[PDB]
Amino acid sequence: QKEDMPPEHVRKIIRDHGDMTNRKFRHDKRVYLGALKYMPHAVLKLLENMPMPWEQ
Amino acid sequence: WEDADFPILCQTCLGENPYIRMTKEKYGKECKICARPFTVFRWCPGVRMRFKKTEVCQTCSKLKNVCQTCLLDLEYGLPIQVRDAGLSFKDDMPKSDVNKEYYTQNMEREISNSDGTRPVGMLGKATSTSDMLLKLARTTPYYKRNRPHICSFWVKGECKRGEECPYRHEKPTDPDDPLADQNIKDRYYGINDPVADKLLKRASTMPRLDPPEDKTITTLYVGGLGDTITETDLRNHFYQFGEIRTITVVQRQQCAFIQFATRQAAEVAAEKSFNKLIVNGRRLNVKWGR
Amino acid sequence: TYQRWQFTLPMMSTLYRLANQLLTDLVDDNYFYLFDLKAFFTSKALNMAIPGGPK
Amino acid sequence: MPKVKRSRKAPPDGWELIEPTLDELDQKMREAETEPHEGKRKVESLWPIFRIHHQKTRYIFDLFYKRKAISRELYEYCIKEGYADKNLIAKWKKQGYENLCCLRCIQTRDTNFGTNCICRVPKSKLEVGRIIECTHCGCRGCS
RNA sequence: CGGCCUCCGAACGGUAAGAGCCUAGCAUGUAGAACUG
Ligand SMILES: [Mg+2]
Ligand SMILES: [Zn+2]
Ligand SMILES: [Zn+2]
Ligand SMILES: [Zn+2]
């Protein structure tokens, strides 16, 4: 099976990449761009899992 | 596009182990020459050797019959210029862009009419194998084809990655050696190839039997026979090559003289025998008598 | 995987009482006499409007 | 301040002695998390996180099974509050896996051929000892 | 004792087209590297 990672793995990845202007990444550039086509799906999945005002 | 089975390249470029690890990536890249998108294969040739990759269009490779990753021929391993010129070949390789696209397309259609055994087109009908090219071939494997690059880090001292460096921690060749500038296009077309040009200066340093002056001197002096050489055996050696006008085997010299009735027979025979005459395992030397 | 619930009636009655203000306080269908679907389908098919209904 | 805790109920009565090491490890993980992306590397910048994760979880694995010094209810609570790692523990239960570097290095899909990464191979099988830092963890021979 | 209540904004369509030169960008991260009695 596929086992889950600790949250700091992704938190660190995203923090590192910041906003892709540093030249270190610069191949992510084109994959980052290619993932645009699926961005309206991430938004739908985000908004339908909204947290419901009786929860913090 | 192409979608195929496996890459054809020199066994030197294949590597040492009898079991290979090759991963297929469909339409992975465009040929450095053809720019046709072709399926690329990746292979790990050995431990701590750089991973090799299929490097040219399948059609472009079936055309010229070279190591589809090492760029060297599949038969002897000779660069295009040298192999062709020693085979007496003057090929019209396309260099134009539009004519190049059309040419690689038509050549893929011809390779489609071909059956996967012989190199398609003229590249086969020059199959008179040249001993100069044979002797110019590296007879043992040159696995230096997979030695890693230099790590600029350790080249300034900086490679603190340990032995995990993906480059050989060796002093970099100061670029001036023309062996550094072999672009894929240069090495493919075989034009302005200075490694093959050094190979050509070598082939000019390689000894053949230089012809003597007097057009009546058809006396070929054989050296290094031993006492186990027979007169009739040397006659059978130089027999089908033309008319042997006289045999004179000097046992007190371990030498001999074959007088020929045809100057062409004498010349072609000596040239075919130069440093290659092997009778009873003896390293026989052909010369022109005085 | 959180499908298929099963409750008891004490639960269901407390749930009912809490949801009491979001709910409709009628027991039957006679309220929606000329205000049900088939009434609105017929109204639409005849291009006439009910006092409180759609056009 | 702490790993602000979702369960809202009282952590059991063995929690206050595991507290200090846990917290200091947490602030430690925050420092290794913030250590910023200099000429460091990219493939090697996630290694400290797997160190400290393995460390957190090996700690709570000690304080339960090896010493028997924690109640099982406190144990499952420390699982639920993200101090422990369920699947790391659940592999560590197996035979050959005492020192698993992380859960991924045995995920076979992440490699092309569907085999574990060389991190898993014992050192005896090599017999040549070329130092290997597994790309995923950075580990050097977990088992 | 009947009720009857629209419309709300954006793009193109006008301010040219170029040939050249100059200089960061942007792509690669390559292939392969000497031979004797
Ligand atoms: Mg107009
Ligand atoms: Zn390991
Ligand atoms: Zn590993
Ligand atoms: Zn690991």
From Swiss-Prot, chain A:
Widely expressed. It is found in: Nucleus; Nucleus speckle. Plays a role in pre-mRNA splicing as core component of precatalytic, catalytic and postcatalytic spliceosomal complexes, both of the predominant U2-type spliceosome and the minor U12-type spliceosome. Functions as a scaffold that mediates the ordered assembly of spliceosomal proteins and snRNAs. Required for the assembly of the U4/U6-U5 tri-snRNP complex, a building block of the spliceosome. Functions as a scaffold that positions spliceosomal U2, U5 and U6 snRNAs at splice sites on pre-mRNA substrates, so that splicing can occur. Interacts with both the 5' and the 3' splice site. The MPN (JAB/Mov34) domain mediates interaction with TSSC4 and SNRNP200. Has structural similarity with deubiquitinating enzymes, but lacks the residues that would bind the catalytic metal ion. It is linked to Retinitis pigmentosa 13: A retinal dystrophy belonging to the group of pigmentary retinopathies. Retinitis pigmentosa is characterized by retinal pigment deposits visible on fundus examination and primary loss of rod photoreceptor cells followed by secondary loss of cone photoreceptors. Patients typically have night vision blindness and loss of midperipheral visual field. As their condition progresses, they lose their far peripheral visual field and eventually central vision as well. This is Pre-mRNA-processing-splicing factor 8. The gene is PRPF8. The chain holds residues 57 to 112 of 2335 of the full protein.
UniProtKB/Swiss-Prot annotation, chain B:
One of its GO terms (biological process) is positive regulation of protein export from nucleus. Keywords: Acetylation, Cytoplasm, Isopeptide bond, Metal-binding, mRNA processing, mRNA splicing, Nucleus, Phosphoprotein, RNA-binding, Spliceosome, Transport, Ubl conjugation, Zinc, Zinc-finger. Its main location: nucleus. There is a cross-link at K125, K135, K276 (Glycyl lysine isopeptide (Lys-Gly) (interchain with G-Cter in SUMO2)). One of its GO terms (cellular component) is catalytic step 2 spliceosome. Component of the pre-catalytic and catalytic spliceosome complexes. Component of the postcatalytic spliceosome P complex. Interacts with PDCD6; the interaction induces translocation of PDCD6 in the cytoplasm. Interacts with PPIL1. The C-terminal RRM domain and the zinc finger motif are necessary for RNA-binding. Belongs to the SLT11 family. This is Pre-mRNA-splicing factor RBM22.
UniProtKB/Swiss-Prot annotation, chain D:
Pfam families: BUD31. Detected in epithelial and stromal cells in benign prostate hyperplasia tissue (at protein level). It comes from the Eukaryota. One of its GO terms (cellular component) is centrosome. Keywords: Acetylation, mRNA processing, mRNA splicing, Nucleus, Spliceosome, Transcription, Transcription regulation. GO terms for biological process: mRNA splicing, via spliceosome. Its main location: nucleus. GO terms for molecular function: nuclear receptor binding; transcription coactivator activity. The modification N6-acetyllysine is found at K125. It is found in: Nucleus. PROSITE patterns: G10_1, G10_2. Residues 59-67 are annotated as: Interaction with AR. Contains a short sequence motif (Phe-Xaa-Xaa-Phe-Tyr) that can bind to AR and may modulate AR activity. Identified in the spliceosome C complex. May interact with AR. Involved in the pre-mRNA splicing process. May play a role as regulator of AR transcriptional activity; may increase AR transcriptional activity. PANTHER family: PROTEIN BUD31 HOMOLOG, PROTEIN BUD31-RELATED. This is Protein BUD31 homolog. It comes from Homo sapiens (Human).
